[PDB]
């Protein structure tokens, strides 16, 4: 269940309300200000890292279940999503439908959106690829 969720359901959830568009209309006050803008923020693919912990001083390093248990740290990994920021503009001639056109400003990077707790012995955990000797080295019970 956890593997299915992490593999598919995260992307499915993010692919529902990915697009958020805010439209600033003409706001007719003078003939020199008649352009209407539309800002769009869209979410694409989602990436998940291995379990990691950031210390107080700001140093981040991979986290293992033994260290998490001993240090009272949450065994979790970071989630990243590609974000596309588009902006369209149109000439708002009175009494006519608008024709939004890209203004050659289409920014596009990974944004941190939180940490997802990772179930042990899962596809995203460090111990799934560990053998018996690896578990003994990592201080985990086979």
């Amino acid at each position: 269940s956890f593997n299915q969720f992490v593999d598919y359901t995260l992307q499915d959830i993010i692919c529902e309300d990915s697009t958020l568009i805010l439209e600033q209309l003409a706001q007719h006050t003078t003939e020199s200000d008649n352009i209407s803008r539309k800002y769009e923020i869209s979410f694409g693919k989602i990436y998940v890292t291995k379990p990691m912990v950031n210390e107080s001083d700001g140093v981040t390093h991979a986290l293992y279940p033994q260290e998490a248990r001993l240090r009272n740290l949450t065994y979790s990994s970071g989630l990243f999503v590609d974000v596309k920021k588009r902006t369209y503009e149109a000439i708002d001639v009175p009494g006519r439908e608008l024709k939004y056109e890209l203004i050659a400003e289409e920014s596009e990077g990974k944004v941190f959106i939180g940490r997802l707790p990772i179930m042990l012995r899962s596809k995203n955990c460090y111990l799934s690829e560990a053998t018996e000797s690896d578990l003994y080295k990592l201080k985990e019970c086979p």
């Binding site: 958020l20 568009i21 805010l22 439209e23 600033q24 209309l25 706001q27």
Partner: peptide, 9 residues
């Protein structure tokens, strides 16, 4: 006048 800022779905 409108709210000059609105959400389109």
């Amino acid at each position: 006048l409108r709210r000059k800022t609105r959400q389109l779905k």
